[PDB]
């Protein structure tokens, strides 16, 4: 119909107009690395982890935000995109705290897994790291903001899904911090979901703290009975 033809690593695929490079790669079975992009949130484009090379184009594009065009050949495993991923992961890990043994997101961390899958295996950062003070947003979400990577997923969720405008960024540059700027509890019927959407151990479940590791647990798929939504 109105579908346009694009190529993922040379393989043809027909997509609707306005489809992003990330979604075209999804239609082929390739998952592009991501930190700030979420399917149910608005597009941000901050983390630059989704950078990918288009054939015969000197500059990489952000796959999560850039609509694909007819005739484009997306090179997901190209050298340029691999080097872009390695550099972005280096920048993300430069100031990250060495908290994995005490971080509750240890065995289920997108930062850890994408570092092992797409980053380098060593560091060349010879400086001191930044440390920020923790905020208190209630008895449900435990906050350790030194682990924050500034993806702004929580802010977008709070504004759009939960309809609460309490979360924001204060400051500028390296010391730009996610929070409320005042002592304020983030209270809503959907507040705990920001734990799941947070890719790192910056936001964790307070009642769940230090009780288990994700590899020990057995998963049972069931139904909630606390209301009539099911």
């Amino acid at each position: 119909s109105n579908l346009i033809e694009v190529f993922v690593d040379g393989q043809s695929v027909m997509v609707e107009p306005g489809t992003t490079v990330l979604q075209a790669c999804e239609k082929v079975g390739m998952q592009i690395p991501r930190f700030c992009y979420h399917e149910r949130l608005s597009v941000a484009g901050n983390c630059r982890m989704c950078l990918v090379e288009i054939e015969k184009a000197p500059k990489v594009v952000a796959a999560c935000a850039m609509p694909v065009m007819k005739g484009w050949n997306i090179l997901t495993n190209s050298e340029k995109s691999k080097k872009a991923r390695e550099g972005v992961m280096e920048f993300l890990l430069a100031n990250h705290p060495l908290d994995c043994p005490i971080c509750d997101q240890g065995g289920e961390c997108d930062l850890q897994d994408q570092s092992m899958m797409f980053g380098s295996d060593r560091s060349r950062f010879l400086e001191g790291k930044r440390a920020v003070e923790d905020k208190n947003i209630g008895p449900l979400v435990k906050t350790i903001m030194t682990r924050c990577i500034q993806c702004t997923r929580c802010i977008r969720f709070a504004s759009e899904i939960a309809g609460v405008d309490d979360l924001g960024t204060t400051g500028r540059g390296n010391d730009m911090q996610v929070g409320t700027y005042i002592e304020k509890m983030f209270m809503s019927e959907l507040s705990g979901n920001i734990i799941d959407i947070c890719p790192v151990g910056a936001l964790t479940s307070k009642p769940y703290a230090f009780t288990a590791r994700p590899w020990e647990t057995r998963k049972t798929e069931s139904i909630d009975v606390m209301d009539a939504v099911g």
């Binding site: 484009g45 630059r48 935000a65 850039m66 400086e127 990577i149 540059g173 390296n174």
Partner: protein, 431 residues
């Protein structure tokens, strides 16, 4: 056809009140040729104005150098339902750059008439001039000139005997260099933080308040009406091919007479310095380095500075770029590593923090640079630093990351022996 550039006659300059020696108000501006035949220009149509800008060869004076007729024609699409706006970039954040301040405080009516002419060309309903927050008296001068223009009927209701309605608004920033980036400027006008937004969409599609928008530099807008009045060919006669016109130049640093001057485009750097800035302190042999186009552009040493022209293409072939034409000169009695490190510290203090490469990597560059000045590092790291800069450039949302990466690359490329000697001296002194 012409080969030698750099002798611009007095009667041929655009900004003839550059030094404020004449009345900056309406009466003096009309005496000097402003607001002449503006009704005729407006009635000649937007397509004619766009063609005049195209054959003029005018390139973006903000620093990128994009052809201005092309952007203003991008805006020339038919109506959609949304209002159309012109945005004038008066942020002027680049270190070494002060030209917009002088053309705003001393010749505001050229800017206002250029706003009207450009808005007519692109079908805009109004113009927003985003003036730097620190330019308080300059902003007040602009507002007084706009008051005069409204009182005389030159802008506003029908704006002439034309039938075209056009408003000019002035909005003030609050201490943010990043708000000179056009999308970050649009974000700041809308009341949010000065964080650049991704492209596409371009401002001609989605801009201020979600409406079609063109962001243009003060100098481009202010020279457009003279281009319309005198002709595109007259403007195109100056400079080389693809480098047309006359450009304002700022000379600062280790010169005898730092000053702002208007001169032909493709002037030699040495000629410009020796003619208008009084020469480099201690004579030409005392020159060490020059940053030719503001802090963003990489520096070049004396050997290339000897016979280099001042335009986009020639300065690109020297691996620098013309930028904003802000010449900053340094003699051999200054610490080049310290100066570059100060520029990197400025960039660290000015990044908005939105995207990880700029935020993290510019902080990392700042820390590495501070150590480099001391010489506390090792020789192997220099290459490391070069790699880090490469990672930043081309991977960020906006060009502030590129503008922080390039000075480091220039310093490495042209003064690696100085860094190595400083490291060796530190190692000897500390054992």
């Amino acid at each position: 056809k012409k080969t030698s550039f750099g002798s611009l006659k007095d009667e041929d300059r655009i900004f003839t009140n550059l030094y404020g020696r004449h009345d900056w108000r309406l009466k003096g501006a009309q005496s000097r040729g402003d607001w002449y035949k503006t009704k005729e220009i407006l009635l000649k149509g937007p397509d004619w104005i766009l063609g005049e800008v195209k054959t003029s060869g005018l390139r973006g004076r903000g620093g990128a150098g994009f052809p201005t007729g092309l952007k203003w024609s991008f805006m020339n699409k038919p109506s959609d339902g949304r209002p159309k706006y012109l945005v004038v970039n008066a942020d002027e954040g680049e270190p070494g750059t002060c030209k917009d301040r002088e053309i705003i405080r001393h010749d505001p009516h050229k800017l206002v008439e250029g706003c009207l002419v450009g808005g007519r060309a692109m079908g805009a309903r109004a113009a927003y001039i985003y003036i730097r927050g620190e330019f308080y008296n300059e902003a007040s001068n602009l507002q007084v000139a706009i008051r005069e223009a409204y009182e005389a009927g030159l802008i506003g209701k029908n704006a002439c005997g034309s039938g075209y309605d056009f408003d000019v608004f002035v909005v003030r920033g609050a201490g943010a260099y990043i708000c000179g980036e056009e999308t970050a400027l649009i974000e700041s006008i809308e009341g949010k933080q000065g964080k650049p937004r991704l492209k596409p969409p371009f401002p001609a599609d989605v801009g201020v308040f979600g409406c079609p928008t063109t962001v243009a530099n003060v100098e481009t807008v202010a020279v457009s009406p003279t281009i319309c009045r005198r002709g595109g060919a007259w403007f195109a006669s100056f400079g080389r091919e693809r480098n047309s016109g006359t450009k304002l130049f700022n000379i600062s640093g280790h010169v005898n007479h730092p000053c702002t001057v208007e001169e032909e485009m493709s002037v030699p750097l040495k000629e410009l310095i020796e003619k208008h800035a009084g020469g480099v302190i201690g004579g030409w042999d005392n020159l060490l380095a020059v940053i030719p186009g503001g802090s963003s552009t990489p520096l070049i040493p004396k050997s290339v500075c000897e016979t280099v022209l001042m335009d986009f293409d020639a300065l690109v072939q020297a691996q620098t770029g013309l930028g904003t034409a802000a010449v900053i000169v340094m003699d051999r009695s200054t610490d080049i590593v310290k100066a570059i490190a100060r520029l990197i510290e400025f960039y660290k203090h000015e990044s908005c923090g939105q995207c990880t490469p700029c935020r993290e990597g510019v902080d990392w560059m700042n820390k590495v640079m501070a150590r480099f000045v001391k010489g506390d590092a090792r020789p192997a790291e220099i290459d490391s630093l070069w790699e880090i800069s490469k990672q930043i450039e081309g991977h960020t949302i906006c060009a502030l990351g590129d503008g922080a990466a390039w000075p480091v690359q220039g310093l490495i490329r042209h003064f690696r022996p100085e860094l190595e000697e400083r490291m060796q001296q530190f190692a000897l002194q500390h054992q």
